[PDB]
Amino acid sequence: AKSKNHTTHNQSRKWHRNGIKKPKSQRYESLKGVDPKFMRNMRFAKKHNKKGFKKMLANNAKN
RNA sequence: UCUAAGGCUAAAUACCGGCACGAGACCGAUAGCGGACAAGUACCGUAAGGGAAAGUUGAAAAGAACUUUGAAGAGAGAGUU
RNA sequence: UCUUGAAACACGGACCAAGGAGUCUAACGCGCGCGCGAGUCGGAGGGACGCGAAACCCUGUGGCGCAAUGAAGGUGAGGGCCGGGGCGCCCCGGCUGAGGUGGGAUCCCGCCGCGCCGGCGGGCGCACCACCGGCCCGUCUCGCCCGCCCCGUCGGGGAGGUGGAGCGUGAGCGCGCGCGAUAGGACCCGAAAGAUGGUGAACUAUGCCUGGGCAGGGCGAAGCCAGAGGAAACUCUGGUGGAGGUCCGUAGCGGUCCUGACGUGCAAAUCGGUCGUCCGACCUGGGUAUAGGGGCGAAAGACUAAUCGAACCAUCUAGUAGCUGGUUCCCUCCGAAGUUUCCCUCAGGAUAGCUGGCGCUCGUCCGUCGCAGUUUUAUCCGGUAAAGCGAAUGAUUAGAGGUACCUAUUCUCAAACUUUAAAUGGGUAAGAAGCCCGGCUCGCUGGCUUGGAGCCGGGCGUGGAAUGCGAGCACGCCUAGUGGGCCACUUUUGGUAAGCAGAACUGGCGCUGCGGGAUGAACCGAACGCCGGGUUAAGGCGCCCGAUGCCGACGCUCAUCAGACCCCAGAAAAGGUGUUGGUUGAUAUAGACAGCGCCGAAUCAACUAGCCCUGAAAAUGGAUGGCGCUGGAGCGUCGGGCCCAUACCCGGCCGUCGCCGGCGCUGGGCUAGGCCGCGACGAGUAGGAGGGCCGCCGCGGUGGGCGCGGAAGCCCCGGGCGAGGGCCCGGGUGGAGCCGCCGCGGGUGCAGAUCUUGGUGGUAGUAGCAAAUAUUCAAACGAGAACUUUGAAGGCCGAAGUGGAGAAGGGUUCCAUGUGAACAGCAGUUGAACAUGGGUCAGUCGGUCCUAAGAGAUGGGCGAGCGCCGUUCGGAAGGGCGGCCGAUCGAAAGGGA
RNA sequence: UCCAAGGUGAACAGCCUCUGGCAUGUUAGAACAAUGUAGGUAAGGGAAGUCGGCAAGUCAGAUCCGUAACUUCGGGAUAAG
RNA sequence: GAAGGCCCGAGGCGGGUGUUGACGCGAUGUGAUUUCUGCCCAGUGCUCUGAGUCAAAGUGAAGAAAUUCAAUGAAGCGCGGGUAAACGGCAAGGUAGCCAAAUGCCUCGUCAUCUAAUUAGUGACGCGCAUGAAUGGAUGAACGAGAUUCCCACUGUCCCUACCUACUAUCUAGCGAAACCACAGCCAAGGGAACGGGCUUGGCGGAAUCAGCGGGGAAAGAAGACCCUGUUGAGCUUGACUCUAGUCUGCAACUGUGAAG
RNA sequence: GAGUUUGACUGGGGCGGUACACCUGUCAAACCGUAACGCAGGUGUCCUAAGGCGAGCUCAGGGAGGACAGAAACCUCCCGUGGAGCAGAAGGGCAAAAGCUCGCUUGAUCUUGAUUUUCAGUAUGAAUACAGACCGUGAAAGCGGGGCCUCACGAUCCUUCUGACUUUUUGGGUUUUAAGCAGGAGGUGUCAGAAAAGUUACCACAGGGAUAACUGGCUUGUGGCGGCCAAGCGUUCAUAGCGACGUCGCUUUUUGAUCCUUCGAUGUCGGCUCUUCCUAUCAUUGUGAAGCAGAAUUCACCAAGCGUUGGAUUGUUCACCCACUAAUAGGGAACGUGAGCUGGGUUUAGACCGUCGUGAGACAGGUUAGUUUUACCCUACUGAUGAUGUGUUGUCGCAAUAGUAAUCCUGCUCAGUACGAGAGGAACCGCAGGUUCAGACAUUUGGUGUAUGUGCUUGGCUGAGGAGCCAAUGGGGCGAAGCUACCAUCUGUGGGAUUAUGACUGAACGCCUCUAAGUCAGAAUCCCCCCUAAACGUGACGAUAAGCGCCGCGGAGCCU
Ligand SMILES: [Mg+2]
Ligand SMILES: [Mg+2]
Ligand SMILES: [Mg+2]
Ligand SMILES: [Mg+2]
Ligand SMILES: [Mg+2]
Ligand SMILES: [Mg+2]
Ligand SMILES: [Mg+2]
Ligand SMILES: [Mg+2]
Ligand SMILES: [Mg+2]
Ligand SMILES: [Mg+2]
Ligand SMILES: [Mg+2]
Ligand SMILES: [Mg+2]
Ligand SMILES: [Mg+2]
Ligand SMILES: [Mg+2]
Ligand SMILES: [Mg+2]
Ligand SMILES: [Mg+2]
Ligand SMILES: [Mg+2]
Ligand SMILES: [Mg+2]
Ligand SMILES: [Mg+2]
Ligand SMILES: [Mg+2]
Ligand SMILES: [Mg+2]
Ligand SMILES: [Mg+2]
Ligand SMILES: [Mg+2]
Ligand SMILES: [Mg+2]
Ligand SMILES: [Mg+2]
Ligand SMILES: [Mg+2]
Ligand SMILES: [Mg+2]
Ligand SMILES: [Mg+2]
Ligand SMILES: [Mg+2]
Ligand SMILES: [Mg+2]
Ligand SMILES: [Mg+2]
Ligand SMILES: [Mg+2]
Ligand SMILES: [Mg+2]
Ligand SMILES: [Mg+2]
Ligand SMILES: [Mg+2]
Ligand SMILES: [Mg+2]
Ligand SMILES: [Mg+2]
Ligand SMILES: [Mg+2]
Ligand SMILES: [Mg+2]
Ligand SMILES: [Mg+2]
Ligand SMILES: [Mg+2]
Ligand SMILES: [Mg+2]
Ligand SMILES: [Mg+2]
Ligand SMILES: [Mg+2]
Ligand SMILES: [Mg+2]
Ligand SMILES: [Mg+2]
Ligand SMILES: [Mg+2]
Ligand SMILES: [Mg+2]
Ligand SMILES: [Mg+2]
Ligand SMILES: [Mg+2]
Ligand SMILES: [Mg+2]
Ligand SMILES: [Mg+2]
Ligand SMILES: [Mg+2]
Ligand SMILES: [Mg+2]
Ligand SMILES: [Mg+2]
Ligand SMILES: [Mg+2]
Ligand SMILES: [Mg+2]
Ligand SMILES: [Mg+2]
Ligand SMILES: [Mg+2]
Ligand SMILES: [Mg+2]
Ligand SMILES: [Mg+2]
Ligand SMILES: [Mg+2]
Ligand SMILES: [Mg+2]
Ligand SMILES: [Mg+2]
Ligand SMILES: [Mg+2]
Ligand SMILES: [Mg+2]
Ligand SMILES: [Mg+2]
Ligand SMILES: [Mg+2]
Ligand SMILES: [Mg+2]
Ligand SMILES: [Mg+2]
Ligand SMILES: [Mg+2]
Ligand SMILES: [Mg+2]
Ligand SMILES: [Mg+2]
Ligand SMILES: [Mg+2]
Ligand SMILES: [Mg+2]
Ligand SMILES: [Mg+2]
Ligand SMILES: [Mg+2]
Ligand SMILES: [Mg+2]
Ligand SMILES: [Mg+2]
Ligand SMILES: [Mg+2]
Ligand SMILES: [Mg+2]
Ligand SMILES: [Mg+2]
Ligand SMILES: [Mg+2]
């Protein structure tokens, strides 16, 4: 009472039945798996980014 | 915190059996109880047990006198409604 | 119906009627509707007071939410702006109450083009999403501050990672509807089994008790008698006797062979002939004993009531079933899978995929986002085909040269070889998430703004390839079915091969009809609402059979097995001086070829290619589909015309779907859940969803409904309506109830289930009414005589009877009269039928009495207990000085006046 | 289970009859085909049939004779003829 | 040898054998007589001895105790002996016998006999696939509804059928079922689920029926007993898993009195 | 004694194998992926270094050399792209490396999260890149948290160990104990992980044509059969008859392969019986060829009309043998044929023996005994009524079509002839019979015989005789009629076109030629006659009832 072992015959039709969908490209992709030492300093760059907010307003006025 | 190795004690509670009632968005004679009827009857098995089928003339029997064919069932008229 | 495949020589279905299969309760999830809403619900109970067991009111105990997290001790969720100060990296004050980036329906404003309408310029940005902070709990690393009456092994906080079903201005709760997965009998029907309790030894197996029965003959044992022989011991002969798991054989009991008869029988084991045994381990009745995992067995798993390799009965029990079978109205729309992973899985599930439903977030003139089974451009990837081995590895042929090697060549190869190397194919990119200019943050990086990344401001569309197209929400949420596939081109593995087995890719079949191939699940064409006209595809156009009934074109071919077109349904090697082409050569008018120098013009050889032919043998008679066709109806090359598919074009109608559709501004109109307009579209199994003014039963409403002037039901060569489910009307029949509309509750729709119950067919006036010799004549009664009765004749049983009486069993069958309806398988004047009466007389026949094997109380013992064990074993004498030793039951064949 | 006539014969065998009983066994008439079931015969050959002398047939009573191999001395034995 | 063997039994001062007592009862094997009954005690099993493992209870030790440790340490196992008319084999290597057998694969063995002809039969031969001695070997009169070979006799078994009789069938009067049945019923070929009756192309096809018949309907009769599957069973068996009645053994209790070592 | 278990995959199942958890090369068709009990292999380990780092060094092999010393000992030089080695299978990688050697070592340590691969994108296993510690090494840059890379491994529960702490040990406190958190290990190889021996023929149930045994279907390896080529055989001569080395086919009477149909069942081996079919012809008919003188035989052609037998053994098909014969050819039809038979084999349950298993049991080893059911239904076939439309009815005929039938041999004669040296030894016509078959038939012979015909006779009965009866036909002798037997007897048949083949004329092709056009002979084959049947076919002819037939275009009308 043997049967069939492996088949990929009708699988291409099933895959394209709803179409092969790529993940929607999102701005600001996820930062998972990045260097932890790099992520530490990048958090500190955003943590103290408001410290130079007064210099930003002064330099924008020169333009 | 209680005082075992002694006892008693109603109510609220349970009830498919029985007795007597009320009811139904239930079943309507192959349904509802097996059983609407001489149903746990007929019938079967040595026995323990198994277990049916089967309700309806019309309002009122007024259920067809009488005549005639046939031995008779069974018919033809007549008659009741 | 299962299936890859069914008209199947696969299964179910003779026929009709009624019944007949997805339910209900609990709990869960999602969607939807309703109420209230950081709440929400009385679902216990209490109180008002026919239908009222309702409804009304109160009660928030409690449940579920509002807080999470850790194993636990436990602890436990506020962001931002402004100013000052500290300059590390986090103090103070104030104003507020969830931040920042990108996107964002809607709203707001400016300007322009026309207080309306379009351009691009900004803003507040919902929900949601991507990302980055922040906070709470667990845990880890690095740590230097702080708090106190219970200063300690005390309790607090920081910084940076990380775990969590968190917080980040709640969304739940109650109720109802639907679907999905469950547990319950669980869609219906079905096991082989298992368990508890009980009933059977009238069959049979065996022991016991008490009875009964078993012709006629054969051989003829021990004992005995007599006569003989012998010197004796002892022997011999005749007769007698009547022994035995002896022989022939009847009854009886068995059951060999015919593998006979029968085999829907006389019979759920019989009949005939034949056969075994028939004084014995013989046969048999009755009374007793042993009871189901037990009994009993001269042993066959035999037998234990037609049941035995574990009886029967009822219950547990609607036992379970990954396995078969069946699973009931119509329509509209969408529409599969036999594949992935895991599984004591491989007839099955879980999971992913494919499916459907429900939506939701947006877009919806150009424009811009966004999208793609496709090209283009740019740039990468690979090691297959082919090639190579005078290159590596491996294999391999032949010579040559120099001195078996060695050099230079040469032949042939690789799938597990390769220097090379495609075609097809895979990945990425083709901008605003960009470019450009100027700054800011950092604790990372460091010779040095040096990097890097993040952030801020400003400026710049020619959107920065072609084409098509609406997208997004981890392609959201729930989700059925499927998880046996099969076939074809190409590629490809095993196999001699296979209508074989196993893969890749795409299409197809399955799920699919249609035209064509005669025919046929897959091939060719083309996919499907209902029609009209037209035109085609593939394929055809002698006739069957629509179309060449053209003065079609050119050749090829004769077949005493001609040939006749994808898949495709019989041919090969090798041959032909059949015929027709072509190729390469060779002789010849200084005269060849062939034939006897004559002859006088071409000839010969090899090879190749078409058609035909040989090669070519199978069994029922037969297959270009058939007829038949040979100036073609054959083969090849083509032309014009013609034939028709559910395909294409145009038109009508129906439905679905889509319109940033239209209409509240009324002769008609607007049941807005309506009406109207436009465009496209239409296959379907399993499956899903919606609609039904389809149908059935019952309820609350409602129609001042219907009905003896005729309801329901039923019948109809009556009239109709609807695409259909169905419905209305008319007639006939019927005789008392019935129906429409809005809601509500289901035991709601049948052709199947070797369905259930009931009824009826063909078979069919058929099988049959055939075991045991046999009836006939006359008469009588009578409507009626092959069957009754009487008489006569002829026969049978032939005293181990077809005779005369009992036992067990039957229970009025006995007897008389009467009936002829049903029964007595023909008939019947007859009956063991039916109806009405009658009939069984005991001291001395049996029961009754006795105990036989047995059974069974008392004492006693056991046992949870109903009870069981036990038949002497205890103060056991109810009589007339007593012995008894075991009450009682147990024989209609024992005992017994 | 009980009673059990005559003839034939060794016989309660088979066959015939008497006493007694019965009407041919849940039907009849006609016909006499095949094929059956049951019964019987068959010339000549005699198991050539067939898995196989299956079935059938031969033999049979009694009387007078005659009776081996073998043997457990009993038998074989109704040997056989 | 009865305080027993064997067995029943839920249970007792229970019950059977047993109204018994070794010439008995119980459990097995072989299977009259005659004739023999060989070898192996390793394995398994039974049985018989007194020198590692060994439960509970009891004793000792440590510890606050629970607990732990130690010593002691039954039966059984292990060790040892016997046993094969125990299972078995031939630790022993098949002895006496027997045979191509009811036992021989090769095989229709070889030889003789039996017939014209013999895979049969018989007598022999035996390195016997795979005979063999109470898992009994060999023989054997009588006996056998046992298997087998031949001969005589006999016969319709046959060559080779025929005829006769009885009851049926058949016909009639009366009476009157059942299995079965999707629809049904003439074929060839083709295709097809690869053996059509129906479809395709042909052959062709004429009411209603009787008696026969056994080709067909892959005829009927029965949800194949063969084969496989099922995480379906049952009967039986063991060196299967897990238990158990029974039985053996140990401890304290019922269990008292006294002496001695 | 009770309960339960006794894996799965699988070209049925079992046995075998593990394709059951993994790895390499290939298959695999140039991304990845991709199956089979596809191919060639590996794995349940090994390593305190064979881990880590640094430094130096260069291998396999070859040439030339150098006491013993040689084809291989060691020393030296030169060449040497790795042709060595790197623990193992294979692939890849690797040269002042990853190899070899040496000296310092324990990054094979303590942690958080992310990622890759198998993937459902779960787990495990094994990997990748960081980060925070603590270290090793090197002068340092760096490198290292196992092995150069691709394999070398394991959930819950439970036990055990280590570590940590405001962790619990339940009204508090202390100490034991127990529990918990976190990280290891003890293992499930059926490797995402039950706790597991059989037997069943005494078997049971659910099913399955998803799946075996029997037919058919595809295939033809094998079997059978037949070509082609021509080495050679045939004294010589390849092809009279043969055919090596090769090679191309056919057949479905072998077997195998496959598993498509059937497991709510297609009765299954042989024989018997019986019909038809095939030819790959054994015999007969007509021919061609020879290593054909005759005879016998061999090869080949047209050809299946006709025939292919009787027996011993065996269940057997198949073989073997005895004879006979013209020959004793080969097969199909569901391996034709079981509601046709027969049960011998096989193929339930009983039983024996051998081998096997401890056992129950098994054995395609042997042996013995073992129920063979139903037709009356539909077609088919066999016969029997009848139906058909021309008025009824009858006689006498025609005839489509269908069936079809004869066959083989012997003796005599030719003829001791032809032929041959002989030995031997035919043929045509003719003649006499026979075999098998067919259709008849009973005069004769045989058989049956219930004319129950006539005798004989047994038992019984009728009083006896006489005459008879009964015994399922009492028995027996003979026997009419009838029926019946190669067991008696009779009869069995003519042509036509042609096949094979041999020829004529005669081209193609000045010749030749059976052929191309045209002609001839020509057969057991074929067709037909003869013969049997007689159609929804029919001709001639007779007789045809107050009814009825002809004749008045009867003369007018009604239905179809
Ligand atoms: Mg599968
Ligand atoms: Mg597999
Ligand atoms: Mg009550
Ligand atoms: Mg009722
Ligand atoms: Mg078929
Ligand atoms: Mg079925
Ligand atoms: Mg049926
Ligand atoms: Mg109904
Ligand atoms: Mg925003
Ligand atoms: Mg059980
Ligand atoms: Mg005798
Ligand atoms: Mg007798
Ligand atoms: Mg009998
Ligand atoms: Mg019989
Ligand atoms: Mg019969
Ligand atoms: Mg006898
Ligand atoms: Mg008795
Ligand atoms: Mg019981
Ligand atoms: Mg048995
Ligand atoms: Mg549709
Ligand atoms: Mg699919
Ligand atoms: Mg199935
Ligand atoms: Mg699904
Ligand atoms: Mg699933
Ligand atoms: Mg399936
Ligand atoms: Mg395939
Ligand atoms: Mg297959
Ligand atoms: Mg399907
Ligand atoms: Mg489709
Ligand atoms: Mg075709
Ligand atoms: Mg049209
Ligand atoms: Mg056509
Ligand atoms: Mg040739
Ligand atoms: Mg040809
Ligand atoms: Mg249109
Ligand atoms: Mg109802
Ligand atoms: Mg219902
Ligand atoms: Mg119905
Ligand atoms: Mg009476
Ligand atoms: Mg009376
Ligand atoms: Mg009657
Ligand atoms: Mg009565
Ligand atoms: Mg008494
Ligand atoms: Mg008495
Ligand atoms: Mg009679
Ligand atoms: Mg004779
Ligand atoms: Mg014979
Ligand atoms: Mg006999
Ligand atoms: Mg004798
Ligand atoms: Mg013994
Ligand atoms: Mg021993
Ligand atoms: Mg010997
Ligand atoms: Mg013989
Ligand atoms: Mg012998
Ligand atoms: Mg011995
Ligand atoms: Mg006997
Ligand atoms: Mg059919
Ligand atoms: Mg059948
Ligand atoms: Mg079945
Ligand atoms: Mg399974
Ligand atoms: Mg059983
Ligand atoms: Mg079991
Ligand atoms: Mg299996
Ligand atoms: Mg690849
Ligand atoms: Mg580190
Ligand atoms: Mg199949
Ligand atoms: Mg071959
Ligand atoms: Mg050859
Ligand atoms: Mg031929
Ligand atoms: Mg014979
Ligand atoms: Mg056959
Ligand atoms: Mg048949
Ligand atoms: Mg049969
Ligand atoms: Mg047969
Ligand atoms: Mg047999
Ligand atoms: Mg048997
Ligand atoms: Mg001469
Ligand atoms: Mg007399
Ligand atoms: Mg008599
Ligand atoms: Mg007689
Ligand atoms: Mg005579
Ligand atoms: Mg000719
Ligand atoms: Mg001629």
Short mmCIF file of C-alpha atoms (C1' of nucleotides) and ligand atoms in Angstrom, two decimals, chain A residues 13 17, chain C residues 335-337 508-512 527 683-685, ligand 29:
data_model
loop_
_atom_site.label_atom_id
_atom_site.label_comp_id
_atom_site.label_asym_id
_atom_site.label_seq_id
_atom_site.Cartn_x
_atom_site.Cartn_y
_atom_site.Cartn_z
CA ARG A 13 -0.27 27.89 -8.32
CA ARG A 17 -3.09 32.41 -6.03
"C1'" G C 335 -14.65 28.46 -4.82
"C1'" A C 336 -10.67 23.99 -3.66
"C1'" A C 337 -6.92 20.13 -1.82
"C1'" G C 508 -4.70 19.69 -17.90
"C1'" C C 509 -8.09 15.92 -15.68
"C1'" G C 510 -10.18 15.33 -10.95
"C1'" C C 511 -14.31 19.97 -10.02
"C1'" U C 512 -16.03 20.63 -16.91
"C1'" A C 527 -14.51 26.87 -21.41
"C1'" A C 683 -18.65 26.67 -15.53
"C1'" G C 684 -18.47 24.02 -10.83
"C1'" U C 685 -17.45 18.83 -6.98
MG MG G 29 -10.45 24.53 -11.63
#
